[PDB]
Ligand binder design. Structure first.
Ligand SMILES: CCCCCCCCCCCCCCCCCC(=O)SCCNC(=O)CCNC(=O)[C@H](O)C(C)(C)COP(=O)(O)OP(=O)(O)OC[C@H]1O[C@@H](n2cnc3c(N)ncnc32)[C@H](O)[C@@H]1OP(=O)(O)O
Ligand SMILES: [Fe+2]
Ligand SMILES: [Fe+2]
Lengths: 221, 341
Protein backbone atom coordinates (compact mmCIF):
# COMPACT_ATOMS: atom_id res chain seq x y z
CA UNK A 1 0.00 0.00 0.00
CA UNK A 2 1.72 3.15 1.19
CA UNK A 3 -0.01 4.75 -1.69
CA UNK A 4 -3.63 5.09 -2.10
CA UNK A 5 -2.75 3.99 -5.60
CA UNK A 6 -6.03 3.81 -7.49
CA UNK A 7 -7.82 1.20 -9.68
CA UNK A 8 -7.52 -1.39 -6.91
CA UNK A 9 -7.66 0.87 -3.87
CA UNK A 10 -10.34 3.24 -5.19
CA UNK A 11 -12.63 0.36 -6.31
CA UNK A 12 -12.47 -1.12 -2.81
CA UNK A 13 -12.49 2.12 -0.83
CA UNK A 14 -15.78 2.94 -2.60
CA UNK A 15 -17.69 0.20 -0.78
CA UNK A 16 -15.88 0.71 2.54
CA UNK A 17 -16.44 4.50 2.48
CA UNK A 18 -20.13 3.88 1.75
CA UNK A 19 -20.36 1.35 4.62
CA UNK A 20 -18.73 3.55 7.26
CA UNK A 21 -20.69 6.73 6.49
CA UNK A 22 -23.98 4.81 6.36
CA UNK A 23 -23.21 3.19 9.72
CA UNK A 24 -22.46 6.65 10.98
CA UNK A 25 -25.78 7.78 9.47
CA UNK A 26 -27.65 4.72 10.69
CA UNK A 27 -26.17 5.22 14.14
CA UNK A 28 -27.19 8.90 14.15
CA UNK A 29 -30.95 8.46 13.89
CA UNK A 30 -30.73 5.21 15.90
CA UNK A 31 -29.45 7.10 18.93
CA UNK A 32 -32.26 9.63 19.10
CA UNK A 33 -35.21 7.20 18.76
CA UNK A 34 -34.28 5.91 22.20
CA UNK A 35 -35.19 9.36 23.58
CA UNK A 36 -38.88 8.50 23.25
CA UNK A 37 -38.21 5.11 24.81
CA UNK A 38 -36.00 6.53 27.58
CA UNK A 39 -37.41 9.72 29.12
CA UNK A 40 -34.69 11.12 31.38
CA UNK A 41 -31.60 10.95 29.13
CA UNK A 42 -33.37 12.32 26.04
CA UNK A 43 -31.04 15.32 25.84
CA UNK A 44 -27.91 13.16 26.24
CA UNK A 45 -28.99 11.04 23.30
CA UNK A 46 -29.42 14.01 20.92
CA UNK A 47 -25.88 15.29 21.63
CA UNK A 48 -24.44 11.83 20.91
CA UNK A 49 -26.62 11.62 17.80
CA UNK A 50 -25.10 14.93 16.67
CA UNK A 51 -21.54 13.56 17.13
CA UNK A 52 -22.49 10.92 14.60
CA UNK A 53 -23.57 13.57 12.10
CA UNK A 54 -20.17 15.34 12.01
CA UNK A 55 -18.39 11.97 12.14
CA UNK A 56 -20.30 11.27 8.92
CA UNK A 57 -19.34 14.72 7.60
CA UNK A 58 -15.72 14.00 8.43
CA UNK A 59 -15.71 10.64 6.66
CA UNK A 60 -17.41 12.43 3.79
CA UNK A 61 -14.32 14.71 3.90
CA UNK A 62 -12.29 11.53 3.41
CA UNK A 63 -14.35 11.34 0.24
CA UNK A 64 -13.11 14.85 -0.50
CA UNK A 65 -9.50 13.75 0.21
CA UNK A 66 -9.59 11.27 -2.67
CA UNK A 67 -11.46 10.98 -5.98
CA UNK A 68 -13.83 8.34 -4.61
CA UNK A 69 -17.51 7.68 -5.46
CA UNK A 70 -19.50 5.93 -2.70
CA UNK A 71 -22.52 3.68 -3.28
CA UNK A 72 -25.24 3.46 -0.62
CA UNK A 73 -27.02 0.72 -2.58
CA UNK A 74 -24.53 -1.96 -1.64
CA UNK A 75 -24.08 -0.19 1.68
CA UNK A 76 -27.71 -0.26 2.81
CA UNK A 77 -28.41 -3.95 2.27
CA UNK A 78 -25.38 -4.48 4.52
CA UNK A 79 -27.30 -2.96 7.47
CA UNK A 80 -30.65 -4.27 6.21
CA UNK A 81 -30.90 -7.16 8.69
CA UNK A 82 -29.38 -5.07 11.47
CA UNK A 83 -31.72 -2.15 10.66
CA UNK A 84 -34.93 -4.19 10.49
CA UNK A 85 -34.23 -5.88 13.85
CA UNK A 86 -33.85 -2.43 15.42
CA UNK A 87 -36.96 -1.08 13.62
CA UNK A 88 -39.13 -3.92 14.86
CA UNK A 89 -37.73 -3.96 18.39
CA UNK A 90 -38.39 -0.24 18.91
CA UNK A 91 -42.02 -0.52 17.73
CA UNK A 92 -42.60 -3.18 20.43
CA UNK A 93 -41.12 -0.89 23.11
CA UNK A 94 -38.16 -3.22 23.82
CA UNK A 95 -35.65 -0.64 24.94
CA UNK A 96 -33.31 -3.32 26.31
CA UNK A 97 -32.87 -5.07 22.97
CA UNK A 98 -32.55 -1.62 21.35
CA UNK A 99 -29.57 -0.52 23.44
CA UNK A 100 -27.74 -3.76 22.63
CA UNK A 101 -27.95 -3.35 18.85
CA UNK A 102 -26.67 0.23 18.88
CA UNK A 103 -24.75 0.98 22.08
CA UNK A 104 -22.92 -2.42 22.10
CA UNK A 105 -23.10 -4.17 18.71
CA UNK A 106 -22.70 -1.14 16.44
CA UNK A 107 -20.20 0.85 18.50
CA UNK A 108 -17.92 -2.14 19.11
CA UNK A 109 -18.09 -2.67 15.36
CA UNK A 110 -17.04 0.96 14.87
CA UNK A 111 -14.29 0.81 17.52
CA UNK A 112 -12.84 -2.32 15.91
CA UNK A 113 -13.02 -0.88 12.38
CA UNK A 114 -11.45 2.46 13.34
CA UNK A 115 -8.58 1.02 15.44
CA UNK A 116 -7.55 -1.34 12.62
CA UNK A 117 -7.82 1.54 10.14
CA UNK A 118 -5.55 4.01 12.00
CA UNK A 119 -2.13 2.53 10.99
CA UNK A 120 -2.78 1.64 7.34
CA UNK A 121 -4.86 4.67 6.33
CA UNK A 122 -3.91 7.59 4.08
CA UNK A 123 -2.08 10.25 6.04
CA UNK A 124 -4.85 12.88 5.93
CA UNK A 125 -7.56 10.37 6.87
CA UNK A 126 -5.43 9.13 9.84
CA UNK A 127 -5.72 12.48 11.60
CA UNK A 128 -9.50 12.65 11.30
CA UNK A 129 -10.21 9.13 12.58
CA UNK A 130 -7.82 9.22 15.57
CA UNK A 131 -10.13 11.91 16.94
CA UNK A 132 -13.36 10.00 16.30
CA UNK A 133 -12.40 6.83 18.21
CA UNK A 134 -12.47 8.30 21.70
CA UNK A 135 -16.07 9.47 21.14
CA UNK A 136 -17.20 5.96 20.22
CA UNK A 137 -15.65 4.66 23.41
CA UNK A 138 -17.92 7.05 25.36
CA UNK A 139 -20.89 6.05 23.26
CA UNK A 140 -20.36 2.47 24.48
CA UNK A 141 -20.25 3.71 28.12
CA UNK A 142 -23.80 5.06 27.78
CA UNK A 143 -25.37 1.64 27.28
CA UNK A 144 -22.86 -0.01 29.65
CA UNK A 145 -23.98 2.04 32.67
CA UNK A 146 -27.71 2.02 31.90
CA UNK A 147 -27.80 -1.78 31.63
CA UNK A 148 -25.54 -2.00 34.69
CA UNK A 149 -28.15 -0.20 36.82
CA UNK A 150 -30.91 -2.25 35.23
CA UNK A 151 -29.03 -5.53 35.13
CA UNK A 152 -31.42 -8.05 36.70
CA UNK A 153 -34.52 -7.11 34.69
CA UNK A 154 -32.51 -6.73 31.50
CA UNK A 155 -30.34 -9.85 31.72
CA UNK A 156 -32.78 -12.34 30.18
CA UNK A 157 -33.61 -10.07 27.22
CA UNK A 158 -29.94 -9.18 26.75
CA UNK A 159 -29.13 -12.89 26.31
CA UNK A 160 -31.98 -13.31 23.80
CA UNK A 161 -31.07 -10.13 21.88
CA UNK A 162 -27.46 -11.32 21.60
CA UNK A 163 -28.39 -14.71 20.11
CA UNK A 164 -30.24 -13.15 17.22
CA UNK A 165 -28.02 -10.21 16.23
CA UNK A 166 -24.45 -11.25 17.09
CA UNK A 167 -24.49 -13.83 14.26
CA UNK A 168 -25.17 -11.02 11.85
CA UNK A 169 -21.88 -9.46 12.66
CA UNK A 170 -19.94 -12.60 11.85
CA UNK A 171 -21.57 -12.71 8.46
CA UNK A 172 -21.15 -9.03 7.90
CA UNK A 173 -17.37 -9.16 8.27
CA UNK A 174 -17.15 -12.02 5.75
CA UNK A 175 -18.94 -9.95 3.09
CA UNK A 176 -16.39 -7.17 3.62
CA UNK A 177 -13.47 -9.57 4.16
CA UNK A 178 -11.88 -9.25 0.70
CA UNK A 179 -12.48 -5.47 0.55
CA UNK A 180 -10.82 -4.78 3.90
CA UNK A 181 -7.73 -6.72 2.79
CA UNK A 182 -7.32 -4.33 -0.17
CA UNK A 183 -6.93 -1.46 2.32
CA UNK A 184 -4.41 -3.35 4.48
CA UNK A 185 -6.82 -4.66 7.15
CA UNK A 186 -6.92 -8.39 7.97
CA UNK A 187 -10.30 -10.03 8.57
CA UNK A 188 -8.93 -11.92 11.59
CA UNK A 189 -7.71 -8.76 13.30
CA UNK A 190 -11.10 -7.07 12.92
CA UNK A 191 -12.91 -9.98 14.67
CA UNK A 192 -10.40 -9.97 17.56
CA UNK A 193 -10.91 -6.25 18.24
CA UNK A 194 -14.70 -6.54 18.09
CA UNK A 195 -14.64 -9.39 20.60
CA UNK A 196 -12.34 -7.45 22.94
CA UNK A 197 -14.54 -4.36 22.79
CA UNK A 198 -17.72 -6.45 23.10
CA UNK A 199 -16.49 -8.65 25.94
CA UNK A 200 -15.34 -5.55 27.85
CA UNK A 201 -18.88 -4.19 27.65
CA UNK A 202 -20.55 -7.40 28.80
CA UNK A 203 -18.18 -7.86 31.74
CA UNK A 204 -18.85 -4.36 33.09
CA UNK A 205 -22.60 -4.74 32.55
CA UNK A 206 -22.28 -7.67 34.97
CA UNK A 207 -21.91 -10.97 33.15
CA UNK A 208 -19.50 -13.53 34.53
CA UNK A 209 -16.68 -14.98 32.48
CA UNK A 210 -18.52 -18.23 31.70
CA UNK A 211 -21.48 -16.40 30.33
CA UNK A 212 -19.27 -14.21 28.28
CA UNK A 213 -17.64 -17.07 26.45
CA UNK A 214 -20.88 -18.61 25.27
CA UNK A 215 -22.42 -15.28 24.31
CA UNK A 216 -19.47 -13.89 22.32
CA UNK A 217 -19.24 -17.09 20.41
CA UNK A 218 -22.54 -16.99 18.59
CA UNK A 219 -22.35 -17.44 14.87
CA UNK A 220 -20.13 -20.03 13.27
CA UNK A 221 -17.32 -17.84 14.49
CA UNK B 1 -2.94 -9.70 42.84
CA UNK B 2 -0.46 -11.67 40.75
CA UNK B 3 -1.04 -12.83 37.21
CA UNK B 4 -0.23 -16.01 35.29
CA UNK B 5 -0.39 -15.60 31.49
CA UNK B 6 -0.29 -18.87 29.64
CA UNK B 7 -1.19 -20.92 26.60
CA UNK B 8 -1.78 -24.45 25.39
CA UNK B 9 0.43 -27.06 23.77
CA UNK B 10 -1.62 -28.12 20.80
CA UNK B 11 -4.91 -27.70 19.02
CA UNK B 12 -5.78 -31.16 20.34
CA UNK B 13 -5.25 -29.97 23.91
CA UNK B 14 -7.29 -26.87 23.20
CA UNK B 15 -10.08 -29.12 21.97
CA UNK B 16 -9.97 -31.28 25.11
CA UNK B 17 -9.51 -28.44 27.58
CA UNK B 18 -12.39 -26.57 25.91
CA UNK B 19 -14.71 -29.55 26.32
CA UNK B 20 -13.47 -30.25 29.87
CA UNK B 21 -14.45 -26.63 30.70
CA UNK B 22 -17.86 -27.39 29.13
CA UNK B 23 -17.68 -25.40 25.86
CA UNK B 24 -18.52 -28.00 23.17
CA UNK B 25 -18.77 -25.24 20.52
CA UNK B 26 -15.15 -24.13 21.02
CA UNK B 27 -13.66 -27.60 20.53
CA UNK B 28 -15.05 -27.87 16.99
CA UNK B 29 -12.81 -25.03 15.73
CA UNK B 30 -9.67 -24.97 13.54
CA UNK B 31 -6.66 -22.69 13.74
CA UNK B 32 -8.64 -19.74 12.49
CA UNK B 33 -10.86 -19.43 15.49
CA UNK B 34 -7.96 -19.42 17.95
CA UNK B 35 -6.21 -16.79 15.77
CA UNK B 36 -8.99 -14.29 16.48
CA UNK B 37 -9.96 -15.27 20.06
CA UNK B 38 -9.57 -12.72 22.86
CA UNK B 39 -7.81 -13.30 26.17
CA UNK B 40 -9.85 -14.57 29.11
CA UNK B 41 -9.37 -14.79 32.85
CA UNK B 42 -10.41 -18.42 33.26
CA UNK B 43 -9.43 -19.12 36.85
CA UNK B 44 -8.96 -17.45 40.23
CA UNK B 45 -6.14 -18.67 42.49
CA UNK B 46 -5.65 -18.44 46.25
CA UNK B 47 -2.29 -19.59 47.64
CA UNK B 48 -1.04 -19.81 51.22
CA UNK B 49 2.67 -19.43 51.95
CA UNK B 50 4.59 -21.44 54.53
CA UNK B 51 5.01 -18.19 56.44
CA UNK B 52 1.20 -17.94 56.53
CA UNK B 53 0.76 -14.98 54.17
CA UNK B 54 -2.14 -15.42 51.72
CA UNK B 55 -2.07 -14.07 48.15
CA UNK B 56 -4.58 -14.09 45.31
CA UNK B 57 -4.05 -14.44 41.60
CA UNK B 58 -5.68 -14.85 38.22
CA UNK B 59 -4.85 -16.97 35.18
CA UNK B 60 -5.09 -15.35 31.71
CA UNK B 61 -5.45 -17.54 28.66
CA UNK B 62 -3.67 -15.91 25.74
CA UNK B 63 -4.99 -18.32 23.03
CA UNK B 64 -1.59 -18.73 21.47
CA UNK B 65 -0.73 -22.15 20.03
CA UNK B 66 2.78 -23.03 18.78
CA UNK B 67 1.25 -24.19 15.46
CA UNK B 68 0.97 -20.47 14.65
CA UNK B 69 4.77 -20.16 14.45
CA UNK B 70 5.19 -23.10 12.07
CA UNK B 71 2.37 -21.57 9.99
CA UNK B 72 4.37 -18.28 9.80
CA UNK B 73 1.68 -16.28 11.61
CA UNK B 74 4.14 -13.98 13.38
CA UNK B 75 1.55 -11.22 12.96
CA UNK B 76 -1.01 -13.19 15.00
CA UNK B 77 1.44 -14.51 17.59
CA UNK B 78 2.38 -10.94 18.48
CA UNK B 79 -1.20 -9.74 18.88
CA UNK B 80 -1.93 -12.59 21.27
CA UNK B 81 1.00 -11.56 23.49
CA UNK B 82 0.08 -7.87 23.49
CA UNK B 83 -3.67 -8.37 24.05
CA UNK B 84 -2.95 -10.65 27.00
CA UNK B 85 -0.56 -8.16 28.59
CA UNK B 86 -2.93 -5.29 27.93
CA UNK B 87 -5.73 -7.43 29.39
CA UNK B 88 -3.86 -8.06 32.66
CA UNK B 89 -3.11 -4.36 33.12
CA UNK B 90 -6.74 -3.31 32.59
CA UNK B 91 -7.62 -5.63 35.49
CA UNK B 92 -5.06 -4.06 37.85
CA UNK B 93 -2.75 -7.05 38.29
CA UNK B 94 0.35 -5.90 40.07
CA UNK B 95 2.90 -8.41 38.71
CA UNK B 96 2.41 -11.05 36.00
CA UNK B 97 4.54 -13.93 34.69
CA UNK B 98 4.78 -14.49 30.90
CA UNK B 99 4.47 -18.23 30.80
CA UNK B 100 5.84 -20.41 28.04
CA UNK B 101 6.29 -18.92 24.62
CA UNK B 102 4.82 -15.54 25.49
CA UNK B 103 8.19 -14.38 26.91
CA UNK B 104 10.01 -15.71 23.87
CA UNK B 105 7.83 -13.83 21.39
CA UNK B 106 8.24 -10.64 23.44
CA UNK B 107 12.01 -10.62 23.05
CA UNK B 108 12.35 -12.22 19.62
CA UNK B 109 10.05 -9.66 17.95
CA UNK B 110 11.15 -6.48 19.81
CA UNK B 111 7.75 -5.98 21.43
CA UNK B 112 9.24 -3.39 23.80
CA UNK B 113 8.89 -1.06 20.80
CA UNK B 114 5.10 -1.58 20.52
CA UNK B 115 4.14 -0.76 24.10
CA UNK B 116 1.08 1.23 23.09
CA UNK B 117 -1.72 -1.27 22.88
CA UNK B 118 -5.26 0.01 22.29
CA UNK B 119 -3.91 3.31 23.48
CA UNK B 120 -2.91 1.96 26.92
CA UNK B 121 0.80 2.24 27.56
CA UNK B 122 2.20 -1.06 28.88
CA UNK B 123 4.03 -0.55 32.18
CA UNK B 124 6.81 -3.10 31.81
CA UNK B 125 7.45 -2.99 35.53
CA UNK B 126 4.25 -5.06 35.87
CA UNK B 127 5.55 -8.20 34.12
CA UNK B 128 8.34 -10.76 34.56
CA UNK B 129 9.60 -13.52 32.32
CA UNK B 130 9.90 -15.81 35.29
CA UNK B 131 13.16 -17.00 33.81
CA UNK B 132 15.38 -16.32 36.86
CA UNK B 133 13.50 -18.80 39.03
CA UNK B 134 13.32 -21.37 36.23
CA UNK B 135 17.12 -21.21 35.88
CA UNK B 136 17.57 -21.72 39.65
CA UNK B 137 15.21 -24.73 39.92
CA UNK B 138 16.96 -26.32 36.95
CA UNK B 139 20.37 -25.93 38.59
CA UNK B 140 18.95 -27.28 41.85
CA UNK B 141 17.46 -30.17 39.84
CA UNK B 142 20.81 -31.06 38.24
CA UNK B 143 22.59 -31.07 41.61
CA UNK B 144 19.80 -33.15 43.14
CA UNK B 145 19.62 -35.82 40.46
CA UNK B 146 23.46 -36.14 40.57
CA UNK B 147 23.37 -37.33 44.22
CA UNK B 148 20.24 -39.49 43.81
CA UNK B 149 22.03 -41.66 41.19
CA UNK B 150 25.52 -41.75 42.65
CA UNK B 151 27.02 -39.42 40.08
CA UNK B 152 29.79 -37.02 41.06
CA UNK B 153 28.76 -33.80 39.37
CA UNK B 154 32.16 -32.20 39.57
CA UNK B 155 33.66 -34.78 37.13
CA UNK B 156 30.61 -35.12 34.82
CA UNK B 157 29.71 -33.72 31.41
CA UNK B 158 26.60 -31.54 31.14
CA UNK B 159 25.16 -30.30 27.84
CA UNK B 160 22.97 -27.19 27.80
CA UNK B 161 20.59 -27.30 24.80
CA UNK B 162 19.90 -23.59 24.33
CA UNK B 163 23.02 -22.39 26.16
CA UNK B 164 23.01 -18.84 24.74
CA UNK B 165 19.38 -18.32 25.84
CA UNK B 166 18.03 -16.33 28.76
CA UNK B 167 17.69 -19.41 30.97
CA UNK B 168 20.49 -21.36 29.24
CA UNK B 169 23.06 -18.63 29.80
CA UNK B 170 22.10 -18.36 33.48
CA UNK B 171 22.25 -22.12 34.05
CA UNK B 172 25.76 -22.12 32.58
CA UNK B 173 27.02 -19.43 35.01
CA UNK B 174 25.59 -21.31 37.99
CA UNK B 175 26.87 -24.68 36.79
CA UNK B 176 30.23 -22.98 36.33
CA UNK B 177 30.82 -21.13 39.63
CA UNK B 178 28.26 -22.57 42.11
CA UNK B 179 28.59 -26.32 41.28
CA UNK B 180 32.03 -26.58 39.63
CA UNK B 181 30.85 -28.83 36.78
CA UNK B 182 33.48 -30.85 34.94
CA UNK B 183 32.89 -30.04 31.33
CA UNK B 184 30.34 -27.73 29.70
CA UNK B 185 28.91 -28.34 26.21
CA UNK B 186 27.22 -25.41 24.43
CA UNK B 187 24.55 -26.01 21.76
CA UNK B 188 22.42 -23.47 19.87
CA UNK B 189 21.49 -22.20 16.37
CA UNK B 190 23.39 -18.90 16.04
CA UNK B 191 27.20 -18.87 16.16
CA UNK B 192 28.05 -15.31 17.21
CA UNK B 193 26.02 -15.58 20.45
CA UNK B 194 27.71 -18.91 21.28
CA UNK B 195 31.19 -17.43 20.78
CA UNK B 196 30.64 -14.66 23.33
CA UNK B 197 29.17 -17.03 25.92
CA UNK B 198 32.37 -19.09 25.69
CA UNK B 199 34.35 -15.86 26.04
CA UNK B 200 32.33 -14.83 29.14
CA UNK B 201 32.64 -18.17 30.92
CA UNK B 202 36.27 -18.83 30.04
CA UNK B 203 35.38 -22.48 29.47
CA UNK B 204 33.16 -24.89 27.52
CA UNK B 205 33.24 -26.50 24.06
CA UNK B 206 30.72 -25.72 21.26
CA UNK B 207 29.12 -28.65 19.46
CA UNK B 208 26.03 -29.18 17.30
CA UNK B 209 23.00 -31.05 18.67
CA UNK B 210 23.89 -34.21 16.70
CA UNK B 211 27.41 -34.40 18.21
CA UNK B 212 26.68 -33.26 21.79
CA UNK B 213 24.09 -35.90 22.80
CA UNK B 214 26.35 -39.03 22.80
CA UNK B 215 28.99 -37.23 25.00
CA UNK B 216 26.70 -35.94 27.80
CA UNK B 217 25.95 -37.56 31.16
CA UNK B 218 23.39 -34.79 31.90
CA UNK B 219 21.32 -33.24 29.10
CA UNK B 220 19.51 -30.00 29.97
CA UNK B 221 16.88 -28.95 27.40
CA UNK B 222 15.97 -25.23 27.48
CA UNK B 223 15.44 -24.51 23.77
CA UNK B 224 12.59 -22.65 22.10
CA UNK B 225 11.46 -25.38 19.75
CA UNK B 226 7.80 -25.14 18.56
CA UNK B 227 7.69 -28.88 17.82
CA UNK B 228 10.14 -31.02 19.77
CA UNK B 229 12.48 -33.69 18.44
CA UNK B 230 12.57 -37.49 18.40
CA UNK B 231 15.67 -38.85 20.20
CA UNK B 232 16.64 -42.60 20.03
CA UNK B 233 18.18 -44.01 23.24
CA UNK B 234 20.93 -45.75 21.25
CA UNK B 235 22.50 -42.34 20.58
CA UNK B 236 22.83 -41.61 24.25
CA UNK B 237 25.26 -42.60 26.91
CA UNK B 238 24.42 -45.00 29.71
CA UNK B 239 23.45 -43.69 32.16
CA UNK B 240 21.85 -40.56 30.84
CA UNK B 241 19.82 -37.97 32.67
CA UNK B 242 17.52 -35.74 30.59
CA UNK B 243 16.10 -32.62 32.25
CA UNK B 244 13.37 -31.31 29.84
CA UNK B 245 12.41 -27.80 30.93
CA UNK B 246 10.84 -26.81 27.57
CA UNK B 247 7.22 -25.90 26.78
CA UNK B 248 6.15 -27.82 24.71
CA UNK B 249 8.46 -30.66 25.64
CA UNK B 250 11.70 -30.54 23.70
CA UNK B 251 11.45 -34.35 23.73
CA UNK B 252 8.77 -35.41 21.20
CA UNK B 253 8.64 -38.94 22.58
CA UNK B 254 9.06 -40.65 25.90
CA UNK B 255 12.74 -41.64 25.73
CA UNK B 256 13.02 -44.90 27.71
CA UNK B 257 15.79 -47.46 28.07
CA UNK B 258 18.31 -49.02 30.43
CA UNK B 259 20.28 -46.15 31.91
CA UNK B 260 17.93 -43.36 30.70
CA UNK B 261 16.47 -41.17 33.48
CA UNK B 262 13.94 -38.49 32.37
CA UNK B 263 13.04 -35.69 34.77
CA UNK B 264 10.42 -33.06 33.88
CA UNK B 265 12.55 -30.00 34.54
CA UNK B 266 11.62 -26.50 35.66
CA UNK B 267 8.84 -27.69 37.99
CA UNK B 268 8.34 -26.92 41.66
CA UNK B 269 6.12 -28.39 44.33
CA UNK B 270 4.31 -26.48 47.02
CA UNK B 271 3.62 -27.89 50.46
CA UNK B 272 -0.11 -26.92 50.48
CA UNK B 273 -2.89 -27.84 48.07
CA UNK B 274 -3.72 -25.08 45.58
CA UNK B 275 -7.24 -23.97 44.63
CA UNK B 276 -7.35 -24.36 40.87
CA UNK B 277 -8.08 -26.43 37.77
CA UNK B 278 -5.43 -25.17 35.34
CA UNK B 279 -2.40 -27.33 36.17
CA UNK B 280 -4.79 -30.29 35.79
CA UNK B 281 -4.70 -29.89 32.02
CA UNK B 282 -0.92 -29.25 31.96
CA UNK B 283 -0.20 -32.96 32.76
CA UNK B 284 1.53 -32.19 36.07
CA UNK B 285 2.43 -35.33 38.01
CA UNK B 286 0.41 -33.93 40.98
CA UNK B 287 -1.62 -30.97 39.69
CA UNK B 288 -2.82 -29.57 43.02
CA UNK B 289 0.77 -29.25 44.30
CA UNK B 290 3.10 -28.95 41.29
CA UNK B 291 3.48 -26.08 38.84
CA UNK B 292 5.98 -24.40 36.54
CA UNK B 293 8.79 -22.43 38.09
CA UNK B 294 8.15 -19.25 36.09
CA UNK B 295 4.61 -19.16 37.40
CA UNK B 296 6.05 -19.62 40.88
CA UNK B 297 8.19 -16.49 40.42
CA UNK B 298 5.04 -14.39 40.09
CA UNK B 299 3.82 -15.80 43.38
CA UNK B 300 7.27 -15.20 44.92
CA UNK B 301 7.39 -11.55 43.85
CA UNK B 302 3.90 -11.16 45.28
CA UNK B 303 4.74 -12.80 48.64
CA UNK B 304 7.73 -10.46 48.99
CA UNK B 305 6.15 -7.33 47.55
CA UNK B 306 8.84 -6.99 44.84
CA UNK B 307 6.44 -5.45 42.30
CA UNK B 308 8.91 -5.12 39.42
CA UNK B 309 10.23 -6.69 36.21
CA UNK B 310 12.61 -8.90 38.23
CA UNK B 311 13.35 -11.10 35.19
CA UNK B 312 13.58 -9.10 31.98
CA UNK B 313 15.23 -9.12 28.66
CA UNK B 314 17.89 -11.65 27.72
CA UNK B 315 21.34 -12.45 29.25
CA UNK B 316 20.62 -10.24 32.26
CA UNK B 317 20.28 -12.90 34.96
CA UNK B 318 23.07 -12.85 37.52
CA UNK B 319 23.97 -15.32 40.27
CA UNK B 320 23.08 -12.68 42.88
CA UNK B 321 19.44 -12.62 41.68
CA UNK B 322 19.16 -16.42 41.34
CA UNK B 323 20.36 -16.68 44.93
CA UNK B 324 17.82 -14.06 46.10
CA UNK B 325 14.83 -15.67 44.34
CA UNK B 326 15.95 -19.12 45.53
CA UNK B 327 16.11 -18.00 49.17
CA UNK B 328 12.52 -16.77 48.85
CA UNK B 329 11.47 -19.95 47.05
CA UNK B 330 12.64 -22.24 49.83
CA UNK B 331 11.34 -19.93 52.57
CA UNK B 332 7.78 -19.87 51.18
CA UNK B 333 7.37 -23.65 50.74
CA UNK B 334 8.60 -24.51 47.22
CA UNK B 335 10.82 -27.48 46.42
CA UNK B 336 12.33 -28.67 43.10
CA UNK B 337 10.84 -31.78 41.51
CA UNK B 338 12.90 -34.89 41.94
CA UNK B 339 13.47 -38.05 39.96
CA UNK B 340 10.48 -40.36 39.88
CA UNK B 341 11.18 -43.86 41.25
C1 LIG C 1 -13.56 -17.50 23.87
C2 LIG C 1 -12.17 -17.85 24.38
C3 LIG C 1 -11.95 -19.36 24.40
C4 LIG C 1 -11.22 -19.78 25.67
C5 LIG C 1 -11.24 -21.29 25.80
C6 LIG C 1 -9.96 -21.84 26.38
C7 LIG C 1 -10.11 -21.92 27.87
C8 LIG C 1 -9.15 -22.92 28.45
C9 LIG C 1 -7.86 -22.30 28.93
C10 LIG C 1 -7.43 -22.97 30.20
C11 LIG C 1 -6.01 -23.42 30.08
C12 LIG C 1 -5.55 -23.96 31.40
C13 LIG C 1 -4.19 -24.57 31.21
C14 LIG C 1 -3.12 -23.53 31.42
C15 LIG C 1 -1.87 -23.84 30.64
C16 LIG C 1 -0.79 -24.24 31.60
C17 LIG C 1 0.60 -24.03 31.05
C18 LIG C 1 0.94 -22.61 31.26
O1 LIG C 1 0.02 -21.93 30.47
S1 LIG C 1 2.35 -22.11 30.42
C19 LIG C 1 3.61 -23.02 31.19
C20 LIG C 1 4.58 -22.06 31.83
N1 LIG C 1 5.73 -21.85 31.02
C21 LIG C 1 6.64 -22.76 31.01
O2 LIG C 1 6.38 -23.88 30.74
C22 LIG C 1 7.99 -22.29 31.39
C23 LIG C 1 8.98 -23.34 31.02
N2 LIG C 1 9.46 -23.00 29.72
C24 LIG C 1 10.45 -22.15 29.59
O3 LIG C 1 11.19 -21.90 30.51
C25 LIG C 1 10.71 -21.47 28.29
O4 LIG C 1 9.59 -21.62 27.43
C26 LIG C 1 11.95 -21.98 27.59
C27 LIG C 1 12.94 -22.55 28.57
C28 LIG C 1 11.68 -23.06 26.58
C29 LIG C 1 12.45 -20.78 26.86
O5 LIG C 1 13.77 -20.42 27.16
P1 LIG C 1 14.18 -18.93 27.06
O6 LIG C 1 15.53 -18.79 27.58
O7 LIG C 1 13.07 -18.29 27.71
O8 LIG C 1 14.15 -18.72 25.51
P2 LIG C 1 15.12 -17.95 24.58
O9 LIG C 1 14.38 -17.53 23.41
O10 LIG C 1 15.89 -17.06 25.40
O11 LIG C 1 16.01 -19.12 24.12
C30 LIG C 1 16.33 -19.29 22.77
C31 LIG C 1 17.59 -20.07 22.52
O12 LIG C 1 17.18 -21.40 22.50
C32 LIG C 1 17.98 -22.15 21.62
N3 LIG C 1 17.29 -22.95 20.62
C33 LIG C 1 16.15 -22.69 20.01
N4 LIG C 1 15.87 -23.65 19.11
C34 LIG C 1 16.86 -24.53 19.12
C35 LIG C 1 17.21 -25.78 18.43
N5 LIG C 1 16.43 -26.34 17.50
N6 LIG C 1 18.34 -26.37 18.73
C36 LIG C 1 19.15 -25.87 19.65
N7 LIG C 1 18.91 -24.75 20.32
C37 LIG C 1 17.80 -24.04 20.11
C38 LIG C 1 18.56 -21.21 20.63
O13 LIG C 1 19.98 -21.35 20.67
C39 LIG C 1 18.03 -19.88 21.08
O14 LIG C 1 18.97 -18.86 20.73
P3 LIG C 1 19.58 -18.97 19.28
O15 LIG C 1 20.81 -19.73 19.45
O16 LIG C 1 18.57 -19.63 18.44
O17 LIG C 1 19.77 -17.54 19.04
FE1 LIG D 1 -19.52 7.57 15.08
FE1 LIG E 1 -20.93 6.16 17.30
Amino acid sequence: ELDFQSESYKDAYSRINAIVIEGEQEAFDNYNRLAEMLPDQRDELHKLAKMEQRHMKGFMACGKNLSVTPDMGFAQKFFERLHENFKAAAAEGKVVTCLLIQSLIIECFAIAAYNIYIPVADAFARKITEGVVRDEYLHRNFGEEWLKANFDASKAELEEANRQNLPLVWLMLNEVADDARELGMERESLVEDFMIAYGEALENIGFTTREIMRMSAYGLA
Amino acid sequence: MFGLIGHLTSLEQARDVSRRMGYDEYADQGLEFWSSAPPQIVDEITVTSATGKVIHGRYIESCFLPEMLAARRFKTATRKVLNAMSHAQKHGIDISALGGFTSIIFENFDLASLRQVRDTTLEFERFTTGNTHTAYVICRQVEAAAKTLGIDITQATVAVVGATGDIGSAVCRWLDLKLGVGDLILTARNQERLDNLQAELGRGKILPLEAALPEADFIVWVASMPQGVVIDPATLKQPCVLIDGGYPKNLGSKVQGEGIYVLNGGVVEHCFDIDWQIMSAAEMARPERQMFASFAEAMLLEFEGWHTNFSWGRNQITIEKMEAIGEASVRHGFQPLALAI
